[PDB]
Symmetry: D2
């Protein structure tokens, strides 16, 4: 998270950290608890090549990575079959947990938006995670969960911005219809935030609008952060995740 600050302990009860087996169970991506037994993340965190389920675990909301881990095994990785790279799209994946989580005030699910939900441009939304604090700058120990408020932008404007200073033809699309953009040169998601949630409080209720997916670096001029647009994939989500 670039430009953010450390979250309050009572916020973001759905944030999860994805861990890979090595010298220690290292954080490599975020995710969100969308059902007691399912985590929503980015395909590129876990694909497109098949990975060993035994080398993946999930950690539910922690204020500081690694301090009090209680790592959870995964029973299935479901990567959207249309995924090959983030810039092509379909950058979305589910992780089925071995057990359903017992939810509490502190750890519980996020609400998915209705299909008809229109997150208007400029709506203040929040992105969270334990990623880099700027380009090639790791989050320091003790690894606090960070948050930053990022305004939604229209795809047409996000696409336009990505063409400024690029050779790509102005009619050749960069920001696809299954993506969603937010952020600016002061506030953005970054590497290691991928897979985590972009949430908007709509009339009092938090909804997950996006999954951190890509961008050209972090908080660079005319390069806002790009997310997988949750409404676009609700039908695929609900093919696996009970409603």
């Amino acid at each position: 998270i670039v430009g953010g600050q450390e979250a309050p302990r009572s916020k973001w009860p759905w944030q999860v950290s994805l861990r890979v087996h090595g010298p220690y169970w290292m954080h490599f991506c975020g995710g969100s608890l969308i059902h007691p037994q399912w985590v929503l993340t980015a395909a590129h965190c876990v694909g497109p090549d098949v990975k060993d389920l035994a080398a993946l675990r999930v950690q539910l909301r922690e204020q500081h990575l690694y301090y009090q881990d209680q790592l959870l095994p995964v029973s299935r990785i479901i990567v959207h079959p249309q995924f090959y790279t983030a810039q092509i799209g379909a950058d979305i994946a589910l992780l089925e947990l071995e057990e359903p989580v017992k939810v509490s005030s502190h750890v519980h699910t996020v609400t998915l938006p209705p299909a008809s939900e229109t997150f208007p441009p400029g709506m203040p939304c929040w992105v969270t995670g334990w990623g880099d604090v700027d380009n090639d700058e790791r989050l320091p120990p003790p690894f606090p969960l960070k948050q930053v408020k990022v305004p939604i932008m229209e795809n047409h404007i996000c696409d336009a911005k990505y063409h400024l200073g690029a050779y790509t033809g102005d009619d050749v699309r960069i920001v696809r219809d299954d993506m969603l953009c937010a952020g600016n040169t002061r506030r953005d998601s970054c590497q290691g935030d991928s897979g985590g949630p972009l949430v908007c409080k709509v009339n009092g209720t938090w909804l997950q609008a996006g999954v951190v997916s890509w961008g050209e670096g972090c908080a660079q001029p005319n390069r806002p952060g790009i997310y997988t647009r949750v409404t676009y994939y609700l039908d695929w989500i609900h093919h696996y995740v009970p409603k």
Copy 2:
């Protein structure tokens, strides 16, 4: 180049080295001289973001990088407008030199294929460059130009290999019709070879079939190297480069 040998001095008179300004004019991609004032290379070497032309030079064929440099400045970078990433495609670009070079047996242009040539399996094809000699393994000093003979694999066969060990659905095409595949687990291009030529000998004349573009790693199982298919982009090249 993986599994090469050092090229003989008399071979590959069209090979060029693209240099970026820093503590020294460092090689980052290859190219090919296709006219006395024009180099063909990969878009991803110079795009999709617009670069300062002053920080780019071209070196004509050299047997060892850096030892006898005579760097040439570039007047225009022209990147295919459909280009955004190598995985999507249109990974092709042109550099116009500030001056026409003088040709000789030593240093001369490569012939572009006619539109009809498909370069089927069994064609004798070579890829050349100053790239890594294996995954994350630099070409050592004195940086000789290397070559390797690479077997062509039909696109559909290549596409199918790319799906092995992947989550991506089998009907979601990875290897696109503007690409071409060549190489195996012994013989491949690698990072720093990008933008260089894949040339095949057809009725006694070397024709540039491909531009080194991407792959999953270098000489990895089921992951042949991928090249931009030059025939696809002849009309575009001809918008800029004279007969």
Copy 3:
């Protein structure tokens, strides 16, 4: 620490962590609390060049680095005047804190040896710290304090091992009389343990025999760890540190 285990919370109440200012207050050496206003450490951690005091803090015993920091500023760095490099010797220094700390069962001083104690082989001695767990292998998050029991080797025996596999003449002393040797190819201190304590239990009271100083690598054949011999420098310590 090589071949350790994580220390129990109730052990080693004198262990401290020395921090340097940067993107975060990063651990670079250990120390020991020998009086409420004084930390003992290795000269090479803070010398021989004079450092900005403002860029140095001390952390009192912590079970995991960084998670619950309460950093303390230092008023004086006092480095043994004979010190230039750890191989020459006098690898010993004192930090005076700006305030006296409050002691407890949790956090308290270590007892210095009487001048007469030699710490011969077979004494039960432990070394503790937050250093590497093997050569070029960091302690992973969550950075627990580690301990390992290390066998003492008499100086002359140690000196003789240091000559094995070396060109240095056998009568040119390597392991000096102000050093002490402990450890083997399973059990050793390592980088980032420097300045921390080697403590041995003598008639029911833990005495600090040594300050982690140097070695050829960590747990390498014929290369036990080398510590500054605290008895050697008692008079110097007592110039500064009260009874």
Copy 4:
């Protein structure tokens, strides 16, 4: 070499490069040809631990490393038995070549000073090599031999300078009597120059005054480069090297 420039091809005919076996025969230290069959270098290049002679080779004067190597095997490494570290001293070593070199105008020996030679303070002397061009800044390809003129300083002044900004007692010697200092914050030797020569033209004749040994970094304030003083070790040199 810091602050220098590329040498003329006709200068420094005695410079040699020491090579270690790996992915390529990499330069790691310099040396000087002091007899047709002997190279003078620094002990720390090849010691104090014993190394495999099969993994060492010598390269005679090259204008650019690696371009035209003709590597020579070594028949014996003689490390001064008083050597353990550069800061202690005796940082001098000989390498006996498998064959005597046929000397020429281009490649030939340097003259050793008489024992009585006094290189006065301020005498302009030259240091050469293929080392770093500043702290942690490698010499770029194509690796030209560099030179820099460095004035000799008296040991007493060099020692004094190393005490400025240090905790080491002003009467505790840092720059020993078997060392010699030269250089300043604009001109110095650096890492990878170790083992090479410091030469002074005395009344028309080049003599080797020093062997590059150590310093605190390169071209840092009050930290001139430190060399092994050749006159000090003439008797040891001439114990092995014919006169």
